Amino acid sequence: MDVNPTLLFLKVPVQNAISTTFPYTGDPPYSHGTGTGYTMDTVNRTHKYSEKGKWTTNTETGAPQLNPIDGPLPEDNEPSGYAQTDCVLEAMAFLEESHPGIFENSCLETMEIVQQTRVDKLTQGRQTYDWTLNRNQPAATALANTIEVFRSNGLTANESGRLIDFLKDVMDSMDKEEMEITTHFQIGKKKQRLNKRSYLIRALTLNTMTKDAERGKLKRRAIATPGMQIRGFVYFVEALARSICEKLEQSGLPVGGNEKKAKLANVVRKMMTNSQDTELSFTITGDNTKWNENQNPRMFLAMITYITRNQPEWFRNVLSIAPIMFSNKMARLGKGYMFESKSMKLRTQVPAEMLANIDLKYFNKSTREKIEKIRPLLIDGTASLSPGMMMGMFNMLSTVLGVSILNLGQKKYTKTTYWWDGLQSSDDFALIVNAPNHEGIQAGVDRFYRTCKLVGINMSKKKSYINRTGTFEFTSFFYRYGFVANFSMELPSFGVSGINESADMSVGVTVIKNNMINNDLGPATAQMALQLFIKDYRYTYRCHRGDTQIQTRRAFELKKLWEQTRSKAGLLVSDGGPNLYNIRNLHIPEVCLKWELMDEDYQGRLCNPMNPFVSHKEIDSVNNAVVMPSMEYDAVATTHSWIPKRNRSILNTSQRGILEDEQMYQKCCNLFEKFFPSSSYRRPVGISSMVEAMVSRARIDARIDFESGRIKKEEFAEIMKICSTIEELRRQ
Amino acid sequence: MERIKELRDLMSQSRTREILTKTTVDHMAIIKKYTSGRQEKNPALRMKWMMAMKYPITADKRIMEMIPERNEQGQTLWSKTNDAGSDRVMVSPLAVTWWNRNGPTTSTVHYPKVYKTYFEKVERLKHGTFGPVHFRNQVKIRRRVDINPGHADLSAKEAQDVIMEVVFPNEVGARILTSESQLTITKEKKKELQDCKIAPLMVAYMLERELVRKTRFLPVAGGTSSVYIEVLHLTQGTCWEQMYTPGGEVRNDDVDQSLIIAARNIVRRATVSADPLASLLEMCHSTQIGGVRMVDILRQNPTEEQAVDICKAAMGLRISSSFSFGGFTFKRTSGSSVKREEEVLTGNLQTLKIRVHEGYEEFTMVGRRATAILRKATRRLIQLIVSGKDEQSIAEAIIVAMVFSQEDCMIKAVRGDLNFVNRANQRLNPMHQLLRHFQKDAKVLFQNWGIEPIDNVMGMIGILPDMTPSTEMSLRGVRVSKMGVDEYSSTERVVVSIDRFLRVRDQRGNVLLSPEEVSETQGTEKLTITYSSSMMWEINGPESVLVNTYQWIIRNWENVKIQWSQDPTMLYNKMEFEPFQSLVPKAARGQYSGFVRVLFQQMRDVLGTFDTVQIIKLLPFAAAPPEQSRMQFSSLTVNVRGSGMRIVVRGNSPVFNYNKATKRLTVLGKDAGALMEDPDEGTAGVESAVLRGFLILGKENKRYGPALSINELSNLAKGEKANVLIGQGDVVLVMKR
Amino acid sequence: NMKKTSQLKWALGENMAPEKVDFEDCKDVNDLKQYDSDEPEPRSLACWIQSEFNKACELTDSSWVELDEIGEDVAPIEHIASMRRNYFTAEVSHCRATEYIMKGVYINTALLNASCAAMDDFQLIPMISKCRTKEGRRKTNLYGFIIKGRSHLRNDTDVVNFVSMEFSLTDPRLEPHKWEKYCVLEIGDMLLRTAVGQVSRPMFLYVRTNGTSKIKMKWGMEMRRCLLQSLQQIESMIEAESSVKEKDLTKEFFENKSETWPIGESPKGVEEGSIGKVCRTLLAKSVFNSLYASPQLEGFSAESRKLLLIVQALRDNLEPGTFDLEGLYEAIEECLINDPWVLLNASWFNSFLTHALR
Amino acid sequence: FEITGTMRRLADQSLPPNFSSLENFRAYVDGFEPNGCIEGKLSQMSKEVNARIEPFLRTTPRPLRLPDGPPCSQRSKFLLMDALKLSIEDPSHEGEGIPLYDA
RNA sequence: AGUAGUAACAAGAG
RNA sequence: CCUCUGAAUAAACUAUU
RNA sequence: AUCUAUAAUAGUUUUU
Ligand SMILES: *O[C@H]1[C@@H](O)[C@H](n2cnc3c(N)ncnc32)O[C@@H]1COP(=O)(O)OP(=O)(O)OP(=O)(O)OC[C@H]1O[C@@H](n2c[n+](C)c3c(=O)[nH]c(N)nc32)[C@H](O)[C@@H]1O
Ligand SMILES: [Mg+2]
């Protein structure tokens, strides 16, 4: 009897067992080598989707640019980027008509946000392409380097601390005839001068790479990272788009999780109720093919221009800068390639800056064709990519465009017996079409398809399907008369996080509890998950029970602690103790759970503030009250809240000196916390220099203490003298 | 002195001086995150890799002076190699477990105070009570609940301001605590934290854990209170419910809210009964709210609400003919009204329904800091007299009275981006939204309300849209006095008589309350409500009532089928259909009943046409006294969470859908069970339970001309066959009996 | 630490990476060219993968998992959960897939620890496992040996080579195509008792070179998650019924075995198993997903989910429609190249298509 | 917030084909009124650009096509069904003794 | 050789 | 021979703090 | 009755 698991679907509906279709217990696919091939393929495909457009040369950068806007209307079903400007404007106008005042209120809120936002908002994120180093750096590091260069080039509006002043600095730097930066080598400092066009090309460049660990894809794909100059404008544009999306029912963003599921269910049921009882209703689960390679920045500029009508000119300019910068963008090719010689048995790395004029005998047929097609677009080591949105950017503005097309489906606009509505989320969509008969359904689907074609949106025919209303799929949520649970999606979260012992224990128990609450994880399976997690935890941290004979380097200490302890149940699992968790007490921290079972000596040693595994404060001498470290998933800090080592790769590079710098920064920051205690709790805001603020605080504190009698006049005189000395040092 | 000396020392050096001089306070945040890079992308893999190393942990240099380099067996506990980018050294977990067993011992007596919330969770779990486990058909609903209760009358920003004031008095910037609650809480916490010896940052985090309120969207069943949401994983499951009561103290407001919800549900289900009073009494005696019998709460709880008053009158307790609105206690001295759903257009171009009360009425409003007498008609404020303490109290009372009057001027004064749906697209109460909108700023409301000259009677002062004491002209119908209080008589519980049909009457004989005056809103309870009876779903929400009604019909399909075939009169009178009949719109009930019953009769007159699904679908609708008519229904409505959801007579519907491939019934997405096939089912494609006086013969037949609508079937005669557009885009040939 | 002999140096890929030089210093080499980036060579499905899956779903006479203790039961729901967990553990601890889980977890843990601790050494790692016989006594089992190569692994995709030697009683000349990567020796004669008489059979040592990365080792160390993915599903099914019956049905399903689900096929037709058989089949499927993880499997699952949903809509009388169905078939088939697991899944999908639409 | 210099020229080079200045485009947008633009464009577009629905019946789907070639071979890291184990009745729990001693 | 799969590892650098 | 090192995309959401 | 406060960390979703 051959075992066929799939046959289980002959009795269990596919949705009710959808979790079986996710093979998320194996490792996900990874990319091994370079991403240059994928970047070249993306650029060539983006230009192919717009080949019938207008070719021009940019007078500021010299890069060829392709303009498909107002291009020929398609005669077939292949993807195309020939959006019609009048149609996009009409879609925006009708969206405004259906929801009066949406754009006005959105613009008011966005004006407040723009006027209030601080520059430190840019420090958020993981990486950022640093134009001063032609590679990726941490966002804070990139911002610091850019501010330093601007200050060296006489661009200091950012001192105001407002993001918009930083954008003014960027705009003013665009007009500089030259820029000067510093470079490191084998760890000296040298000066480099960039002419206007070189700096302009660097400012419009987005780095590219390959994405790793993505589920459900056979082939790899490319992703992009924006530069420092464009982040602020994109942030403001996305704030406006978020404000707009918050006011639309069809929008699937920016809501998520249970709230998103509730909103989608409410919207779908309202659509069902509005449907007449004597007309067919169908639902289309749809995908859009190459959404980001067919959307054009110029159409986003048009949409922003229409949205910001009757608004102050400065607001319109600051919003319009982003599409302007994105339609003149460049793409970094990547690492390059590697060549191998079998006879000589050697390997070498060929950088991507040489692809412009490298002989094509080394490459195979596919790569040779890629390079030949892309060579005309290569400038200064990058590729000219005018059309298309690169990767995962302007998601909410794309959502607005999709929702406008959905809004075009009302009977007041179709002017016939069929109509449609549905749900939009970036590029994914579900479409409910109502019509008296099947021919009406066909006509409505065709009209929706063609209207999407007009605005440069292509419905994926091979990934989209249609059935009767009642079941569909949207953004990986499977609706079968209501959304169904999918446990396999969250399954990778089970295990050991890798923060430390306390945090990992908390994360494991909390994950089990949350999956019980949300993903329909049963009681018995919850208990078995707890057992498996404790097993994995003990094996990872070498903290098996003290009454066992598992051979590990940590077993001797645990055995001694177990033998010297009277109350065993009070010991943590990290100390070789037993497991006291069950269903009823998954919501309680481990240390608090067994606090009333710990020996006094063990409890005091565990929660001893003077433990070198957690740092110490400096108020008075040392805050010897509680173990204090960023305490995520760690309610109570103990000796098990230690911190692991750091990666030491940079020690073999020229950037290792940067370590010193950051250390020194910390030093200074530490001192600032001795004058302003609230800085750690809440972020300080000011324009004065750190030294000036500290000296002023010292003077005012001395005066207040002397007036209130907390200090004697000798200390006051000494503090004033030292303040004067610091003032003298400030000038010298 | 140490701070200034260290600052001078740093300023002496060049790099430190440059950093301190060129860096503003704003850029201090940027440089604080400055780093060479945290090259970690797989923390779990990295942890597994590192734990195989000799010295994966980092520790301060002090460890070299506190822990020996080797233990008894010579195993190394730490090394002298520093961590890159810092001055900390590398150590082994053996060091941690050596400290835990041989380190110096301190006094950890204040930890329970620092982490009071978690030990409070432990105490609540310790003293909790466990009941039985019931297996049922759970219907979890996605709603916003609170996971951190925080303080009652505070928000996130207010709590943060209070924390800053208490812990960082000099860092509060320009904020001033204007709310009375904020000032009182600040004083109380300063008194409590007087002469504290804990670090300010940890005190701030403690106050954050104690005071800040946190809410999240979760799929919940039962109670939405914080104490009931912390153990949500234990008490509610996909198919089971565990009875559990937290062991702490219960807030009074939660008890009041739960009592109001329970009373409303009980009264609504009792109205549809043949003997409402006895049903209400037994339901009250069979209900618990958070582990406490409902009768005890009704005895010891002073709640002003219509349904609670009806329950108290049924139990013989003295009541108050008062309700709450906008923070004021309204009490109708005279007049009467009838509710009516009216569609209106908002000032900001929004269309919404409102429950307008018609008729003339007079009320007295009592507030914590204001009092008034109001006289109104249908969407018309006849007059208002306000005697508040200061300008703010009178303004608030005026706004509440204006919104209460349901004036068109008030509706047209709505401006800005005001929404009448939740962020999850769930309907909100229009009156509460209007109150919240106009309480922030009522300048436009006052400007558009109107002005009118006054007669200067009794010396009562005037008031202008600018909120000033005028004497010639004042706001239309509004007057300001000083001697109007009559507040003692508000708490004057009176003895009343309750009729069999739940009509509360005064000693004189005038009607005070009736079931029609109870709100139709279907809310959720803060504390879990437990019902003990044959039907534990008798006073549940609409979705649970629907699913359980159809599940009951399916489970008892054998005797139900026999009874339907033999003696239908007794079947329609089952007590199980009454909760379902409560959901059907009242004005429609009889009509629907009539319709359905006729179908069944035809289903018995014509043999060979016995569809189980049709009978199961339509049976709950035949439980009301029939009203004869000739109307044709293609669907029957049911009120679910304020929306009218339709059940289609023929074919599947969003609510009730039957699947033949699996032979399974789904009600609102919940599996009600699998029907069992009967040999008597008619396998001939003939339907005789769709139209009131017609028999569906087959699919489309082009012989008899084009199809016509359902409502145009009254022109046919006996024996005439015709094509009808009955169903979802389907045309079928039918004949008239 | 094994000595760096010539045989081990060859078998473990010692000094096999080409020397890394600058392009300027080698641009004039005649045969210098790009790395070979050809697509995988196609392979056809064989019968041995189905037999592997059939055996992996069978019951054993030894307990392979000894789950850890938890807190005491106080609430009635905890008692019900403990009873159901006893049923689940009894069903899942005596499965061959659980043995594979333990074997893989142990091997990957040992390989990772050796790789970190001994970067530049050839270590000898026995393949050990622990079980308990039906009578309840412990037993230690040896499967073979592994020899580790150098583990100077920088990226998460860097490969550490090793040599795997494993005992077996399977004659390698019955299905030679299955063992193209192995060099099978003969190392002894083993006496086995069939009924009452002893019989002598050859004992073979399958020897091969293999490799693994840190990501693969890490995901092999976490193979116990497979258990959850099965049990959860099973429990859901049970609960789905209790709701409509308003009573726990764990004992009814496990003991009475009244309700069955189609789980396989025979020459007669579709075969239905009990709840335990379904649980073991799902566990085996999860374990094989873990052992045979590849991009082809990911692509096939993602692409065939849509076709499953379309067939489901057809079976629900929801009048499904398509636009470019041939495009969907091409997308599905683009992922079937050479992986036995993905090919077997495709065959299973074809069988399901045959049985569902009849 | 003003757009001047390099930024103004980049803006002038970021418009639909028939516009040469940012201010001209803004003037066009401010006065825009929807007058049958979408309907006209739809009328112009050919009827080959359509989404024709093909019913999915029980006889529509076909079996998947598996690749041809030599049979696939074992690729697991260890033997699965062909494994043989040498066992000892050692009274020990999981991972207690020395692996080499047990071997 | 082997892992693997559209490009890499089979140690790199000083 | 010897020294060092084992590798951080965007948006939104979820959980904890 | 309403309910998008910030910042850190990890996980999930978003293919010609
Ligand atoms: O949490 C909900 C409810 O339980 C809670 N509540 C209600 N009563 C109390 C008390 N007494 N203490 C504490 N909490 C209480 O407040 C929430 C109310 O929710 P919801 O069900 O949405 O409100 P309701 O449906 O009751 O309508 P509401 O707008 O609040 O009106 C209250 C009351 O006033 C009556 N009413 C309004 N108007 C305009 C009236 C009128 O013109 N004439 C007459 N006779 N009555 C009028 C409402 O119908 C209700 O009776
Ligand atoms: Mg989709």
PDB file of C-alpha atoms in Angstrom, chain A residues 87-177:
ATOM      1  CA  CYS A  87      -6.155  58.116 -17.251  1.00  0.00           C
ATOM      2  CA  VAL A  88      -4.090  58.289 -14.046  1.00  0.00           C
ATOM      3  CA  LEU A  89      -5.274  61.848 -13.417  1.00  0.00           C
ATOM      4  CA  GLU A  90      -8.878  60.774 -14.022  1.00  0.00           C
ATOM      5  CA  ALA A  91      -8.508  57.869 -11.594  1.00  0.00           C
ATOM      6  CA  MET A  92      -7.200  60.248  -8.930  1.00  0.00           C
ATOM      7  CA  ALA A  93     -10.022  62.703  -9.662  1.00  0.00           C
ATOM      8  CA  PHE A  94     -12.713  60.040  -9.301  1.00  0.00           C
ATOM      9  CA  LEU A  95     -11.102  58.735  -6.109  1.00  0.00           C
ATOM     10  CA  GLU A  96     -11.336  62.280  -4.749  1.00  0.00           C
ATOM     11  CA  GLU A  97     -14.950  62.488  -5.933  1.00  0.00           C
ATOM     12  CA  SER A  98     -15.966  59.287  -4.139  1.00  0.00           C
ATOM     13  CA  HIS A  99     -14.258  60.314  -0.861  1.00  0.00           C
ATOM     14  CA  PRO A 100     -14.554  64.103  -0.570  1.00  0.00           C
ATOM     15  CA  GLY A 101     -11.815  65.832   1.388  1.00  0.00           C
ATOM     16  CA  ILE A 102      -9.499  62.810   1.552  1.00  0.00           C
ATOM     17  CA  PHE A 103      -6.557  64.524  -0.146  1.00  0.00           C
ATOM     18  CA  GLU A 104      -7.039  67.783   1.773  1.00  0.00           C
ATOM     19  CA  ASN A 105      -6.993  66.159   5.217  1.00  0.00           C
ATOM     20  CA  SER A 106      -4.154  63.852   4.186  1.00  0.00           C
ATOM     21  CA  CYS A 107      -2.118  66.880   3.107  1.00  0.00           C
ATOM     22  CA  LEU A 108      -2.860  68.685   6.379  1.00  0.00           C
ATOM     23  CA  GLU A 109      -1.646  65.736   8.452  1.00  0.00           C
ATOM     24  CA  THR A 110       1.412  65.307   6.236  1.00  0.00           C
ATOM     25  CA  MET A 111       2.246  69.012   6.531  1.00  0.00           C
ATOM     26  CA  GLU A 112       2.218  68.653  10.306  1.00  0.00           C
ATOM     27  CA  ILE A 113       4.438  65.564  10.056  1.00  0.00           C
ATOM     28  CA  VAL A 114       6.883  67.302   7.705  1.00  0.00           C
ATOM     29  CA  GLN A 115       7.135  70.365   9.934  1.00  0.00           C
ATOM     30  CA  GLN A 116       7.667  68.239  13.070  1.00  0.00           C
ATOM     31  CA  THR A 117       9.918  65.379  11.930  1.00  0.00           C
ATOM     32  CA  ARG A 118      13.498  65.288  13.227  1.00  0.00           C
ATOM     33  CA  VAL A 119      16.621  64.228  11.354  1.00  0.00           C
ATOM     34  CA  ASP A 120      17.260  61.303  13.714  1.00  0.00           C
ATOM     35  CA  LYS A 121      14.370  59.531  11.978  1.00  0.00           C
ATOM     36  CA  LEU A 122      16.893  58.666   9.261  1.00  0.00           C
ATOM     37  CA  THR A 123      18.974  56.618  11.711  1.00  0.00           C
ATOM     38  CA  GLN A 124      16.209  54.006  11.604  1.00  0.00           C
ATOM     39  CA  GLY A 125      16.870  51.064   9.312  1.00  0.00           C
ATOM     40  CA  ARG A 126      19.530  48.399   8.947  1.00  0.00           C
ATOM     41  CA  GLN A 127      21.808  49.441   6.062  1.00  0.00           C
ATOM     42  CA  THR A 128      22.240  52.411   3.749  1.00  0.00           C
ATOM     43  CA  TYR A 129      24.348  52.964   0.645  1.00  0.00           C
ATOM     44  CA  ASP A 130      26.998  55.483   1.728  1.00  0.00           C
ATOM     45  CA  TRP A 131      27.943  57.666  -1.234  1.00  0.00           C
ATOM     46  CA  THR A 132      31.250  58.542   0.464  1.00  0.00           C
ATOM     47  CA  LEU A 133      32.376  54.883   0.456  1.00  0.00           C
ATOM     48  CA  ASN A 134      30.563  53.308  -2.537  1.00  0.00           C
ATOM     49  CA  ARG A 135      29.136  50.499  -0.395  1.00  0.00           C
ATOM     50  CA  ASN A 136      26.656  49.800   2.392  1.00  0.00           C
ATOM     51  CA  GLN A 137      27.103  51.085   5.942  1.00  0.00           C
ATOM     52  CA  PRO A 138      24.847  51.143   9.004  1.00  0.00           C
ATOM     53  CA  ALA A 139      22.213  53.847   8.684  1.00  0.00           C
ATOM     54  CA  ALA A 140      23.543  55.864  11.625  1.00  0.00           C
ATOM     55  CA  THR A 141      27.106  55.600  10.307  1.00  0.00           C
ATOM     56  CA  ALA A 142      26.022  56.715   6.835  1.00  0.00           C
ATOM     57  CA  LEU A 143      24.117  59.687   8.250  1.00  0.00           C
ATOM     58  CA  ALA A 144      27.075  60.690  10.422  1.00  0.00           C
ATOM     59  CA  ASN A 145      29.501  60.528   7.492  1.00  0.00           C
ATOM     60  CA  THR A 146      27.164  62.536   5.255  1.00  0.00           C
ATOM     61  CA  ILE A 147      26.683  65.205   7.928  1.00  0.00           C
ATOM     62  CA  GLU A 148      30.447  65.401   8.438  1.00  0.00           C
ATOM     63  CA  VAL A 149      31.072  65.839   4.704  1.00  0.00           C
ATOM     64  CA  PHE A 150      28.351  68.482   4.416  1.00  0.00           C
ATOM     65  CA  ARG A 151      29.834  70.399   7.347  1.00  0.00           C
ATOM     66  CA  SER A 152      33.261  70.214   5.705  1.00  0.00           C
ATOM     67  CA  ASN A 153      31.650  71.618   2.526  1.00  0.00           C
ATOM     68  CA  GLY A 154      29.823  74.480   4.255  1.00  0.00           C
ATOM     69  CA  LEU A 155      26.337  72.907   4.405  1.00  0.00           C
ATOM     70  CA  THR A 156      25.217  73.215   8.032  1.00  0.00           C
ATOM     71  CA  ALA A 157      21.443  73.736   7.899  1.00  0.00           C
ATOM     72  CA  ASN A 158      21.124  70.244   9.384  1.00  0.00           C
ATOM     73  CA  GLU A 159      22.297  71.761  12.675  1.00  0.00           C
ATOM     74  CA  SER A 160      18.669  72.832  13.091  1.00  0.00           C
ATOM     75  CA  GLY A 161      17.861  69.169  13.768  1.00  0.00           C
ATOM     76  CA  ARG A 162      14.907  69.096  11.358  1.00  0.00           C
ATOM     77  CA  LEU A 163      14.738  66.607   8.501  1.00  0.00           C
ATOM     78  CA  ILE A 164      13.547  69.286   6.070  1.00  0.00           C
ATOM     79  CA  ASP A 165      16.680  71.333   6.769  1.00  0.00           C
ATOM     80  CA  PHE A 166      18.722  68.235   5.930  1.00  0.00           C
ATOM     81  CA  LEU A 167      16.795  68.039   2.652  1.00  0.00           C
ATOM     82  CA  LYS A 168      17.667  71.693   2.025  1.00  0.00           C
ATOM     83  CA  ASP A 169      21.305  70.740   2.611  1.00  0.00           C
ATOM     84  CA  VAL A 170      20.994  67.920   0.067  1.00  0.00           C
ATOM     85  CA  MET A 171      19.489  70.282  -2.501  1.00  0.00           C
ATOM     86  CA  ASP A 172      22.223  72.863  -1.912  1.00  0.00           C
ATOM     87  CA  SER A 173      24.916  70.186  -2.229  1.00  0.00           C
ATOM     88  CA  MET A 174      23.455  69.251  -5.613  1.00  0.00           C
ATOM     89  CA  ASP A 175      24.519  72.723  -6.813  1.00  0.00           C
ATOM     90  CA  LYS A 176      28.085  72.603  -5.462  1.00  0.00           C
ATOM     91  CA  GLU A 177      30.684  72.737  -8.219  1.00  0.00           C
TER      92      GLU A 177
END
